[PDB]
Design an enzyme around this catalytic site. Structure first.
Site, PDB file in Angstrom:
ATOM      1  N   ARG A   1      48.807  42.051  48.368  1.00 21.87           N
ATOM      2  CA  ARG A   1      48.378  43.363  47.900  1.00 21.87           C
ATOM      3  C   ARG A   1      48.083  44.291  49.073  1.00 21.87           C
ATOM      4  NH1 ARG A   1      43.545  41.279  44.231  1.00 21.87           N
ATOM      5  NH2 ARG A   1      43.656  39.757  45.955  1.00 21.87           N
TER       6      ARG A   1
ATOM      7  N   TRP B   1      35.533  50.338  48.461  1.00 20.22           N
ATOM      8  CA  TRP B   1      34.548  49.269  48.292  1.00 20.22           C
ATOM      9  C   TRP B   1      33.438  49.400  49.324  1.00 20.22           C
ATOM     10  CZ3 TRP B   1      36.902  46.274  44.409  1.00 20.22           C
ATOM     11  CH2 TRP B   1      36.086  45.288  43.836  1.00 20.22           C
TER      12      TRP B   1
ATOM     13  N   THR C   1      34.173  31.971  45.974  1.00 19.84           N
ATOM     14  CA  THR C   1      35.514  32.567  46.005  1.00 19.84           C
ATOM     15  C   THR C   1      35.510  34.009  45.495  1.00 19.84           C
ATOM     16  OG1 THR C   1      36.187  31.762  43.798  1.00 19.84           O
ATOM     17  CG2 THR C   1      36.695  30.329  45.666  1.00 19.84           C
ATOM     18  N   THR C   2      34.357  34.502  45.032  1.00 21.45           N
ATOM     19  CA  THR C   2      34.205  35.940  44.758  1.00 21.45           C
ATOM     20  C   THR C   2      34.258  36.731  46.060  1.00 21.45           C
ATOM     21  OG1 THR C   2      31.780  36.056  44.964  1.00 21.45           O
ATOM     22  CG2 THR C   2      32.673  35.518  42.768  1.00 21.45           C
ATOM     23  N   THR C   3      34.003  36.020  47.159  1.00 24.16           N
ATOM     24  CA  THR C   3      33.828  36.535  48.521  1.00 24.16           C
ATOM     25  C   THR C   3      32.514  37.277  48.701  1.00 24.16           C
ATOM     26  OG1 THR C   3      34.908  38.739  48.307  1.00 24.16           O
ATOM     27  CG2 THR C   3      36.341  36.848  48.761  1.00 24.16           C
TER      28      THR C   3
ATOM     29  N   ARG D   1      31.517  37.242  39.604  1.00 27.86           N
ATOM     30  CA  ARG D   1      32.274  36.105  39.059  1.00 27.86           C
ATOM     31  C   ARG D   1      32.579  36.252  37.567  1.00 27.86           C
ATOM     32  NH1 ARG D   1      35.521  33.533  41.484  1.00 27.86           N
ATOM     33  NH2 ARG D   1      36.579  34.881  39.978  1.00 27.86           N
TER      34      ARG D   1
ATOM     35  N   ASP E   1      34.825  39.411  36.656  1.00 26.42           N
ATOM     36  CA  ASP E   1      36.208  39.184  37.035  1.00 26.42           C
ATOM     37  C   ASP E   1      36.895  38.162  36.127  1.00 26.42           C
ATOM     38  OD1 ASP E   1      38.544  39.154  39.164  1.00 26.42           O
ATOM     39  OD2 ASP E   1      37.988  37.074  38.841  1.00 26.42           O
TER      40      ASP E   1
ATOM     41  N   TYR F   1      35.706  47.103  37.374  1.00 26.41           N
ATOM     42  CA  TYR F   1      36.195  46.391  36.195  1.00 26.41           C
ATOM     43  C   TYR F   1      35.768  47.050  34.902  1.00 26.41           C
ATOM     44  CZ  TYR F   1      37.363  42.491  39.263  1.00 26.41           C
ATOM     45  OH  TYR F   1      37.895  41.705  40.255  1.00 26.41           O
TER      46      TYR F   1
ATOM     47  N   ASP G   1      41.163  44.750  35.906  1.00 26.66           N
ATOM     48  CA  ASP G   1      41.033  44.538  37.355  1.00 26.66           C
ATOM     49  C   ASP G   1      41.511  45.765  38.135  1.00 26.66           C
ATOM     50  OD1 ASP G   1      41.034  43.761  40.043  1.00 26.66           O
ATOM     51  OD2 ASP G   1      42.332  42.036  39.762  1.00 26.66           O
TER      52      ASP G   1
ATOM     53  N   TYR H   1      41.019  46.770  41.233  1.00 25.52           N
ATOM     54  CA  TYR H   1      41.460  46.587  42.616  1.00 25.52           C
ATOM     55  C   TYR H   1      42.944  46.237  42.682  1.00 25.52           C
ATOM     56  CZ  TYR H   1      41.930  44.577  47.310  1.00 25.52           C
ATOM     57  OH  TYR H   1      42.352  44.268  48.583  1.00 25.52           O
TER      58      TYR H   1
END
Length: 536
Positions: free
Chosen positions: A252, A261, A389-391, A429, A432, A508, A513, A515
């Site tokens: 992406r 962001w 993993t959401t960062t 989390r 998403d 969101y 989504d 992004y």
């Protein structure tokens, strides 16, 4: 190895941000006038003998106009006095605003201020249904509750149904303000986004507007916008010169959306260095995500994961060429950060972000293993992996790097996964997962959050999405509680975490989504914040 074919939309911005030349004469003119308007405004705040309602409205207006960051001391002193004098003798409008403003600033005002507006049963008096300004302020206040505020349990539903009923017949711009609030409450919105709407759509059109404040707000918004454009130009050139757009075409291309962001996390000029460092990290981890999700093979992803743990340029040769590109870029970025923080003697704090990055990539790899094995973990196991993993532990840590006042003790607190951070991560989390469930399901991803939820509890997609919504509501109450005094670290280091949660809600919105698909939601925001100035 034949890879999965690319399906991401290209960047919709091209090169329109790549070069921005500030007009120094206009900038100096704006700054010169702002200094004057800033003092007039300070004197408005320090004015003696104002009524409670007038004082709260002035503070609220200055905050919504986006200029309160100039008056943090004055506003805090005034709210602190209001908190301590305990005035419980007003109408719904003033009471609800008093509650919201104090709570948003960490003053734990009792929710009993609302008892006089409720019957014996704890339900709001329906006789209040004809008071539109009371309903609006109650609505906004209902979003700042903690777990100790169940007296407010009915407030969102009550104010919503009656605002909806009243809205079509309200004068303007009140009608537009109410309509907007029902789509996006203030407390959970991105501050620059809400500021841009308030200035142009509401306050500019108010018959009662204060002209000094409106001019101040417009000049300040446009002056800051000039800085943001410089930053985005500087970041766009950095991205262009990495040329992932051509050498890693599976990924992406979203550096503008990444900038949005970072702008959401903080917009003030003193966080300029912080914003630029942050957007680079968001950009780069986005590349890593797409490599795990949409290109790399099981064996490749294993080598990549191991190289990240070892964090040594000697490891590049273990990687396929295309992975060498991002791996070197990552290591170089952190060398850049180190050099950039050298003159302040703050280089050593970079390792905190690095360790969080390693954590994200380990868990990316776990997620890939789960996919290949067709494993559907219980929800508790799912979350133990998927939270990182959401960062968002990583982004929060990264947000501190360019903050000059952040100390080792601040990083130490953040490293222990405090509740306010955990809540923000959880919000990212579950939101998403709810939005990307159908898509990831189509791509055969059997370990999606909602799926784990359905299989674990033996419930439908609808019930599972409803349970996830509850987790998000619980987390917002934890965030609100986390802002209350005494805070474990300075409020300055909590607000980025709050703002990360806001960006989730805004991106969101309507369960999509934004992004990955910027056209619907993010594109208008980026145009309003980074392309069009407010007309004066």
């Amino acid at each position: 190895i034949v890879r999965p074919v690319a399906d991401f939309s290209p960047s919709l911005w091209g090169d329109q941000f790549l070069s921005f030349s500030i007009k120094n004469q206009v900038a100096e003119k704006y700054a010169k006038e702002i200094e004057a308007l800033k003092e007039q405004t300070r004197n408005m705040l320090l004015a003696t003998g104002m009524k409670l309602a007038d004082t709260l409205n002035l503070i609220d207006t200055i905050e919504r106009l986006g200029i309160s960051y100039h008056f943090e001391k004055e506003i805090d002193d005034i709210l602190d006095q209001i908190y301590n004098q305990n005035s419980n003798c007003n109408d719904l409008c003033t009471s609800a605003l008093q509650f919201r403003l104090l709570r948003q600033h960490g003053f734990n005002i009792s929710p009993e201020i609302f008892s006089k507006f409720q019957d014996e049963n704890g339900k709001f008096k329906e006789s209040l249904a004809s008071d539109v300004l009371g309903l609006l302020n109650l609505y906004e206040a209902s979003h700042v509750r903690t777990h100790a505020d169940d007296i407010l349990e009915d407030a969102l539903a009550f104010s919503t149904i009656h605002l909806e009923s009243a809205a079509p017949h309200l004068k303007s711009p009140l009608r537009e303000q109410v309509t907007h609030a029902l789509e996006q409450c203030l407390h959970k919105g991105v501050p620059r986004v809400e500021t841009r709407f308030f200035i142009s759509s509401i306050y500019d059109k108010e018959q009662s507007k204060n002209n000094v404040l409106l001019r101040f707000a417009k000049l300040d918004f446009n002056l800051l916008q000039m800085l943001h454009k410089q930053e985005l130009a500087q970041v766009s050139r950095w991205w262009k010169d990495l040329d992932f757009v051509t050498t890693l075409p599976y990924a992406r291309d979203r550096v503008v959306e990444c900038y949005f962001w970072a702008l959401g996390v903080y917009f003030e000029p003193q966080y300029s260095q912080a914003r630029v460092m942050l957007v680079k990290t968001i950009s780069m981890i986005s590349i890593v995500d797409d490599t795990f999700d949409a290109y790399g093979t099981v064996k490749e992803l294993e080598a990549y994961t191991d190289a990240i743990q070892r964090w040594d340029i000697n490891e590049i040769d273990r990687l396929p060429d295309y992975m060498k590109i991002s791996y070197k870029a990552i290591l170089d970025l952190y060398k850049d950060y180190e050099k950039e923080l050298s003159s302040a003697g703050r280089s050593h704090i970079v390792c905190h972000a690095i360790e969080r990055m390693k954590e994200v990539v380990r868990n990316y790899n776990v997620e890939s293993t789960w996919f290949i094995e067709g494993y559907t973990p219980p929800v508790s196991e799912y979350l133990s992996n998927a939270l990182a993993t959401t960062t968002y532990y990583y982004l929060a840590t990264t947000s501190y790097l360019g903050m000059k006042s952040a100390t080792e003790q601040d990083f130490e607190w953040l490293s222990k996964n405090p509740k306010i951070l955990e809540a923000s991560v959880i919000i990212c989390r579950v939101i998403d997962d709810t939005a990307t469930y159908e898509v990831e399901k189509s791509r055969g991803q059997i370990a999606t959050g909602i799926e784990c939820c359905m299989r674990d509890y033996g419930i439908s997609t609808k019930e599972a999405m409803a349970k996830f919504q509850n987790m998000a509501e619980t987390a917002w109450k934890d965030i609100n509680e986390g802002l209350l005094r005494p805070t474990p670290v300075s409020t300055e280091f909590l607000t980025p975490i709050l703002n990360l949660a806001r960006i989730v809600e805004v991106t969101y919105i309507h369960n999509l989504d934004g992004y990955t698909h910027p056209e619907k939601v993010l594109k208008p925001h980026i145009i309003n914040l980074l392309v069009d100035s407010i007309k004066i």
